[PDB]
Amino acid sequence: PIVQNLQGQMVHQCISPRTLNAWVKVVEEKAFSPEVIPMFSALSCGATPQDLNTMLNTVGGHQAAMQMLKETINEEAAEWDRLHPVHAGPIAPGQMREPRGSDIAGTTSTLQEQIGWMTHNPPIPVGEIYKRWIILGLNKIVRMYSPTSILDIRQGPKEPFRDYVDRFYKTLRAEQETLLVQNANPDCKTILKALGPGATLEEMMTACQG
Amino acid sequence: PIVQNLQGQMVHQCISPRTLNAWVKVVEEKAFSPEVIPMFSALSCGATPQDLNTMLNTVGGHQAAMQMLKETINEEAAEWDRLHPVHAGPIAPGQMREPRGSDIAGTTSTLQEQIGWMTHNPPIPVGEIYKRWIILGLNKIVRMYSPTSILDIRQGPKEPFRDYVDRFYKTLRAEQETLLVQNANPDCKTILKALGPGATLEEMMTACQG
Amino acid sequence: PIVQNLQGQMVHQCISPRTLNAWVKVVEEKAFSPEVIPMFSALSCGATPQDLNTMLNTVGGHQAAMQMLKETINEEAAEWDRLHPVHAGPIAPGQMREPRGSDIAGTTSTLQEQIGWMTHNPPIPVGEIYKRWIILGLNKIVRMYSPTSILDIRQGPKEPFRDYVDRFYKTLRAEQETLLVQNANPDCKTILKALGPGATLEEMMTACQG
Amino acid sequence: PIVQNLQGQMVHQCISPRTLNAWVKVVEEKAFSPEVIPMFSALSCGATPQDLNTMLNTVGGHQAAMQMLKETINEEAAEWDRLHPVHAGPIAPGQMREPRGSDIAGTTSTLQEQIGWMTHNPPIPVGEIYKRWIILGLNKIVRMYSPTSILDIRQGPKEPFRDYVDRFYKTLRAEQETLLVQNANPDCKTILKALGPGATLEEMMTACQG
Amino acid sequence: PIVQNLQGQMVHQCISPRTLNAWVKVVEEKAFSPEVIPMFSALSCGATPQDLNTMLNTVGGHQAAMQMLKETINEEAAEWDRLHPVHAGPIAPGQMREPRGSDIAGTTSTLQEQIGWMTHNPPIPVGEIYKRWIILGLNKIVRMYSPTSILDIRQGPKEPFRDYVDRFYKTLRAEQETLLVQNANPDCKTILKALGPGATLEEMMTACQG
Amino acid sequence: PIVQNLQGQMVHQCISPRTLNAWVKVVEEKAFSPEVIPMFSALSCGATPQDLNTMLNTVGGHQAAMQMLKETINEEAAEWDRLHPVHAGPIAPGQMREPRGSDIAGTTSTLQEQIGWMTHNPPIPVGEIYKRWIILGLNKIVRMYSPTSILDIRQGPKEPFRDYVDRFYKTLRAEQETLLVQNANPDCKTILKALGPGATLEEMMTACQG
């Protein structure tokens, strides 16, 4: 990634073995759960487009999702070229050429060019633009691999209300208020209807404790 | 987080994979025990609002508690806007705009803005203000998930006094003096009543050793 | 490797025990899966030819592949000498001699010479030239050890379409569009034929969900 | 803690996840064995009063001992106020207010104030003063939880003298010379009595080897 | 070891616990396999003669090999004194005395003297000279503990050619072309004889795939 | 320990949790094997007398040996006072008082005084003087706990000569040439007697391979 060192300058440093291993392990253990996306954004802090492709390439398996990640990046890269056409001409000394979509994705750009774009003044955050494309495609993967719909998360007759709300918002996070009340069991729904329409979650959970 | 480097300046650095993993593991192993709150405050030392949302997002499951954490942050953010209304006008060069409640929560604020607020002179510790909101909501979660009341922690007839005091103050910490004497078994309560009302814990524990 | 320190200068530092262990473990666990190649490129970030030979030497076993890696490096080193003949003459003060193929492979070159080449102005990235030779030979090993052909990856009658696409592009990555449709089961192929020839993968996967 | 950086100045840095985990694990595995006290003093090297409360708060369970640690800190803090009464008056620029007992314990003091006290010239080591209070209370816990008295550590008829001396000074360390000779078995005590009253331990152990 | 810090100067730093543990573990797990030698050279990067003796001393067991390592170092140290006799005389200020064989082995030399030799201008790499002696003796140990001769590595009638070449060059690496063809089974040797005398390994392996 | 930072000055830094854990684990797993002594010397690189007492205090159990370590340190400290009597008088500004035996052992000396002694010009290496006392006492512990004598290490009738030499020099290292030949079995001793009195170990091991 690009990290500010002891001085104020932004400089490139190699991706650490801990970062490489942490990203590989979180995909092996949690696949494409919703919490894998913010873990990816944190492990790729300040990452160059080369570092982003490194993390995505180290993932063995799940190639159906990774191929869908290819098509999404290609769609976003094509829209970038539609909105930012590169103007031909010799690049002035001390300046950088305009990045294309494939340049932001690290396909037609070198590490030196990515360092120049990200450390420019003003900078061209090609790493954050690429990560924004990857996270978008990763969110489409999480929604596609979401197994349960929010309409099928109903509280059991003996299920504690806390455990049911855990399953409700867990499914809601993968799929990306009153339905929570409607899907409760008859005993708790009677309690929640007498509580008022403007109750908080900690008020609803406290009312249906057992 | 924002860490003072070799020079005196405060600069941003990426959250480490060790910090990300340490927070995820402590929630998997201890859930919402009282000691998870100070562990969260230590792992989020100098954290920006972005780093705080990162730690809260990496938590898979327990979404009922995390959704209650949303409503608490929204309540504290709304009170911040009620006490600190943003005055319109162009921001002077070298200055930062006034943060709103959602800006402190990292919702409508960029990392660059959070760096400017936290490294300002004088600084606006939006990270510590946000963490103070999160810890408050986390304390409400610990009290809600506290299983046992302090009134039901009584010493057994054969239970050693040390083990009973362990259960007493463990429950007392989750729920957030004379009751300790009252809930002791008849043999130790006779000893403690003859010891005096101003005895220390190490004096009470020494008196009921067996 | 060669890492820019606190100052702007590029300086040599020893390869870390974490990097040594991470490369040995990834070969023990995944052998020559496609994702081992980008893991090798990331762990050898900024590596000198000496560090590259170190990583390749620490691999115990798989010597059939490592010997094929020798012949590939020898072929690329011989082509380098054919395109870059060293011109005889005394080396001027502050300058470096022209590297041969065996010099880039770290065979006839010292660490001091590799530091001088990589930190020259302009630099001679003998480490990146050598790594480009190693990755090329490693790609030939992955293709040789690829067990299944893409023609034999067909969807089962009861196999979910997601799992089949996982096996399809996993094999496709090792071997290095319409065939994916042709190798599907009759039920999904009927669905995909009525979808159109320009469908995306997430559209094809959504159409054959079961 | 407060660590001298590259320059000569003392600056604050966040407590590391390794330090947090090392202290939690050593209490889970060894509870209040005598060697836990020096482990606590080493892990809290240069720690601020905030870092000390962090380590003590991350301990789950053993709340009977931790509550006794509260009363000891309160006793030492009350004695500090009895010996160092704070004199009222406006604090001069560049100076710090006089710390109270609760200020040294991190109860009524901010991290900024603790940084100012510990980095003052001359410094006020509120962290070392607080740690001296904690270690004192921790030593009272070790002595209270010491199970065996030194009077009951006697050498068995077939017990090797080395193993018996191991149990002797292990108990002696928890409880905090001739008794070692008296508590030996008749065979070794006959040997030690003929050795002289001024024998060393390695001389006594060598004399009773079997 | 001696590592260049933030400035250009070479300075001594303590050997890390990770380096100490990594060397002890690799000897416990792989003993004296050929890949242990380059692992030793990498873990001892920039090591002083004191650090080299530290790594060799931390090895418990295998003392027969370590004693053979003593005699080899003594032989190389005696040859160094035969080629570099120390000339008597007072050492000038800012200069270092000429190292003997036992000085390079860290036997009659202090750490301060080793720092002065390795950081001299021009430097006397006593650490690299000592490591060159140790690696030479370690190579004699690997050849002595090599169990199988290359003449006894023959391909089985049903053994895949890939697995046989793995055993061939594994044995060849421990012992330190046409024989590979001769030791193949009759079916593959017929294929290799019709392939030509100038075939590569990947051509020979491809020809005998089954 | 005292480590040279980015500048040339020697400064104190806290002992790392990895160093604390590495020393505790090596005593739990290997007790007082000979290789524990050089592991202690490496982990205590640049350690102050306070850090040395920290490592020795974190050892739980083995108190018989640790108490023998007390008496040895007391003997060496008493000899230091006999050879270096402290001359009374006011200490000049910028100077340090003469250390006593208990000052070198960290008993009557503060960390600030130990920093002043070790960073003086010229320095007083009280840490290396103390470590030299500890290693001496640790060597007496290894010899006392050495179970087998070198006279009882004889080669079995069917024992391979390599395994027997492993047991020979392993015992020889704990206890601290021709005997190796005498203690061999009759078959190998006949071979070694016909080899000559000036044979090396690798020659003797090669001659008795089976």
Ligand SMILES: Cn1nc(NS(C)(=O)=O)c2c(Cl)ccc(-n3c([C@H](Cc4cc(F)cc(F)c4)NC(=O)Cn4nc(C(F)(F)F)c5c4CCC=C5)nc4ncccc4c3=O)c21
């Ligand atoms: C090659 N490249 N081409 C693209 N677009 S394109 C013409 O339409 O195909 C494409 C795009 Cl859009 C984005 C980036 C890459 N990029 C990759 C990518 C990363 C990546 C992106 C993902 F979104 C998901 C990933 F997991 C990895 N790695 C690969 O794709 C490796 N891979 N190979 C094959 C196969 F063998 F089947 F072809 C398959 C894969 C993974 C996906 C399924 C099959 N690595 C690199 N390393 C070194 C140097 C440059 C690059 C690089 O620039 C791009």
Ligand SMILES: Cn1nc(NS(C)(=O)=O)c2c(Cl)ccc(-n3c([C@H](Cc4cc(F)cc(F)c4)NC(=O)Cn4nc(C(F)(F)F)c5c4CCC=C5)nc4ncccc4c3=O)c21
């Ligand atoms: C999105 N946002 N919106 C809010 N308030 S609001 C209109 O009323 O809803 C809200 C508030 Cl108050 C605080 C912060 C966030 N914030 C989050 C939050 C963090 C967070 C806060 C918690 F207090 C508890 C957490 F675990 C995580 N992450 C999410 O909330 C992710 N999430 N999504 C859904 C669902 F899919 F169900 F919608 C659910 C969750 C977790 C809780 C239960 C369901 N991440 C971010 N990352 C990247 C960039 C910005 C942001 C961000 O600004 C805020």
Ligand SMILES: Cn1nc(NS(C)(=O)=O)c2c(Cl)ccc(-n3c([C@H](Cc4cc(F)cc(F)c4)NC(=O)Cn4nc(C(F)(F)F)c5c4CCC=C5)nc4ncccc4c3=O)c21
């Ligand atoms: C010695 N050298 N010679 C070559 N070309 S050449 C005349 O034709 O043979 C050759 C080439 Cl092309 C590339 C680099 C090396 N290089 C190696 C190589 C690395 C390497 C390259 C690979 F591509 C695969 C690897 F795993 C390791 N290590 C070895 O080869 C060790 N090894 N030994 C034997 C055997 F004993 F069988 F001979 C075998 C091996 C491994 C492969 C199978 C057998 N390490 C070194 N360390 C210290 C100092 C210099 C060097 C070094 O310069 C070169």
Ligand SMILES: Cn1nc(NS(C)(=O)=O)c2c(Cl)ccc(-n3c([C@H](Cc4cc(F)cc(F)c4)NC(=O)Cn4nc(C(F)(F)F)c5c4CCC=C5)nc4ncccc4c3=O)c21
């Ligand atoms: C709150 N505070 N108050 C005190 N003195 S006082 C009026 O008489 O009670 C007291 C004293 Cl003397 C010392 C320090 C604290 N301090 C603690 C303490 C640390 C601590 C000290 C110990 F010596 C042992 C510990 F483990 C932890 N943490 C707590 O005490 C948490 N806790 N809560 C309860 C309960 F819920 F039961 F109340 C219990 C505990 C732990 C002990 C048993 C019950 N953390 C903090 N974090 C953030 C900011 C400030 C602070 C803080 O200033 C002080």
Ligand SMILES: Cn1nc(NS(C)(=O)=O)c2c(Cl)ccc(-n3c([C@H](Cc4cc(F)cc(F)c4)NC(=O)Cn4nc(C(F)(F)F)c5c4CCC=C5)nc4ncccc4c3=O)c21
């Ligand atoms: C003592 N010294 N003497 C030598 N040459 S000499 C007169 O002929 O014997 C000799 C040589 Cl040539 C090389 C270096 C050492 N050196 C060792 C050596 C390292 C070493 C070298 C190896 F090549 C293999 C190793 F594993 C370790 N450590 C030891 O040897 C410890 N050891 N002790 C005994 C025994 F007890 F049996 F005597 C045995 C061993 C290990 C080998 C088998 C028995 N450590 C040290 N630490 C602190 C300070 C200085 C030194 C040191 O200078 C030298």
Ligand SMILES: Cn1nc(NS(C)(=O)=O)c2c(Cl)ccc(-n3c([C@H](Cc4cc(F)cc(F)c4)NC(=O)Cn4nc(C(F)(F)F)c5c4CCC=C5)nc4ncccc4c3=O)c21
């Ligand atoms: C206290 N002190 N006194 C000594 N000499 S003296 C009057 O004759 O007794 C003595 C000497 Cl010579 C050397 C150093 C210490 N030193 C220790 C020592 C370290 C140490 C040295 C060893 F060589 C072996 C060790 F493991 C630890 N720690 C202890 O001894 C703790 N301990 N306590 C008891 C008991 F409870 F039984 F008393 C026992 C032990 C361990 C040994 C067996 C019993 N830590 C400290 N921490 C904080 C601050 C100062 C100090 C300290 O200065 C010295």
Ligand SMILES: [Cl-]
């Ligand atoms: Cl790392």
Ligand SMILES: [Cl-]
């Ligand atoms: Cl995976």
Ligand SMILES: [Cl-]
């Ligand atoms: Cl794959």
Ligand SMILES: [Cl-]
């Ligand atoms: Cl831009």
Ligand SMILES: [Cl-]
């Ligand atoms: Cl369901």
Ligand SMILES: [Cl-]
């Ligand atoms: Cl419930």
Ligand SMILES: [Cl-]
């Ligand atoms: Cl569910």
Ligand SMILES: [Cl-]
């Ligand atoms: Cl990390």
Ligand SMILES: [Cl-]
């Ligand atoms: Cl969890």
Ligand SMILES: [Cl-]
């Ligand atoms: Cl979730």
